[PDB]
Amino acid sequence: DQLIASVVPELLPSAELYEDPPGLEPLPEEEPLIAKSVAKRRNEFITVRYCARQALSVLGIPEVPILKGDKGQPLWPDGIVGSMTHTEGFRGAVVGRTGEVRSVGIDAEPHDVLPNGVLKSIALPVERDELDALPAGTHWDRLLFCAKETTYKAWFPLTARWLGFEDAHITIDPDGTFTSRILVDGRANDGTVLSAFDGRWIIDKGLILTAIVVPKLA
Ligand SMILES: CC(C)(COP(=O)(O)OP(=O)(O)OC[C@H]1O[C@@H](n2cnc3c(N)ncnc32)[C@H](O)[C@@H]1OP(=O)(O)O)[C@@H](O)C(=O)NCCC(=O)NCCS
Ligand SMILES: [Mg+2]
C-alpha cells in the first residue's frame, strides 16, 4: 500500500505519513534548524524526521538527531545511508546500512504539470522529444523533474559534488523504471566512478514517488 515500500528493496526500511499528526516535536539539537521557519516548513521537517526515526529503529538505531550538512544533505549515523522527501500530502524517509547498499535517494512530487518555464530549465532537448513520445495520461514532465531530483539525492552522498539538471539524461519507462546517465565526470569520493543509475517510480494518491538505490559494489 505504501509508496516508498513499492519502489525500494525490502532491506531498506521506510516510513511515510500523508498528514502532520498532532503533537510531534523536533529533537532539541534539531530545533535551531527551523527556529525561524514558517509553519509549513517546520511541519515537513518534523514529520519527515519522525518517519526517518521510525525506519532507523527497524535497523536497531535508537533516537538520534538528523541534522543538515553544508549543501543541505541529511547527516546520518555512521554506517547508515538514507533519504527524505516532503511535499503537500507526503512525508517519507528510507534508510539502509552501508554494508547492504551504497546510496539511496527518494523524491515525492505532486502529479501535476510542471510550472510554466520549468521544463525548459530542467530537460535536455532530447528529453523533451522523448517525453512527447510517451503514452498519454501521465505528467511525464513532472516525472522527469522528480527523477532528476532523486538522481541528485543518490549522487551527492557518494560524490560531495553538484549535479545539475543538464548533467544527467533520464529515460523514463512506462513500466515503472527509469535510468539516469551521468554526462559529467563521475568520480566518487572513494575513487570509484558513477556513470548510470537505475530507478523506480510509482504514481498514487495524486503523487509521484521516484527512488534510486545504488547497489552494493559487485
Ligand atoms: C535538494 C533537492 C534535490 C530537494 O528535492 P525537492 O524535491 O526540492 O525536496 P524534497 O522535499 O523531495 O527533499 C528535501 C530533502 O532533501 C534532502 N537533501 C537536501 N539537500 C540534499 C543533498 N545535497 N543531498 C541529499 N539529500 C539532500 C534533505 O533531507 C531535505 O529535507 P530536510 O531539509 O527536511 O532535511 C532540490 O531542492 C534541489 O536543490 N535540486 C537541485 C539539484 C538537482 O535536483 N539536480 C538534478 C540532478 S539530474
Ligand atoms: Mg519533491
Rounded to a whole number of angstroms, the distance between the first and last alpha carbons of the chain is 31
Atom of ligand 1 nearest to the CA of 87: 11
> How many CB atoms are located within 10 Å of the residue 138 CB?
16
Kindly state if the Cβ of 86 falls inside 6 Å of ligand 1. Answer: yes
CA pair distance 153, 158, nearest whole angstrom: 9
Does the annotation list 44 as a binding residue? yes
Taking CB atoms within 8 Å and a gap of at least 24, the contacts of 133-140 are 134/172, 134/174, 135/174, 138/111, 138/174, 138/203, 139/111, 139/112, 139/113, 139/114, 139/208, 140/172
What are the residues whose beta carbon lies below 5 Å from ligand 2 (ion)?
87, 107, 109
Gap from CA of 149 to ligand 1 centroid (Å): 7
Does the annotation list 85 as a binding residue? yes
User: Using the 8-state DSSP alphabet, how is residue 191 labeled?
Assistant: S
User: Using the 8-state DSSP alphabet, how is residue 6 labeled?
Assistant: G
**In DSSP terms, which residues pair with 123 in a beta bridge?**
none
| Separate counts of helices (H) and strands (E) for the chain | 4, 8
Which grid cell is 19?
498528514
Gap from CA of 87 to ligand 2 centroid (Å): 6
Taking CB atoms within 8 Å and a gap of at least 24, the contacts of 68-71 are 68/33, 71/156, 71/160, 71/162
Kindly state if the Cβ of 151 falls inside 6 Å of ligand 1. Answer: yes
Kindly state if the Cβ of 127 falls inside 6 Å of ligand 1. Answer: no
Residue with CA at minimum distance from ligand 1 atom 40:
149
CA pair distance 166, 121, nearest whole angstrom: 8
Kindly state if the Cβ of 131 falls inside 6 Å of ligand 1. Answer: no
Among the bound ligands, the one closest to the CA of 159: 1
Atom of ligand 1 nearest to the CA of 107: 12
- Which of 146, 149, 150 for a ligand 1 pocket mutation test, highest count of atoms within 8 Å of Cβ? 149
Kindly state if the Cβ of 4 falls inside 6 Å of ligand 1. Answer: no
Experimentally determined by: X-ray
CA pair distance 66, 104, nearest whole angstrom: 16
Kindly state if the Cβ of 43 falls inside 6 Å of ligand 1. Answer: no
CA pair distance 49, 15, nearest whole angstrom: 10
CA pair distance 119, 36, nearest whole angstrom: 32
Contact 141, 119 (CB under 8 A): yes
Among the bound ligands, the one closest to the CA of 161: 1
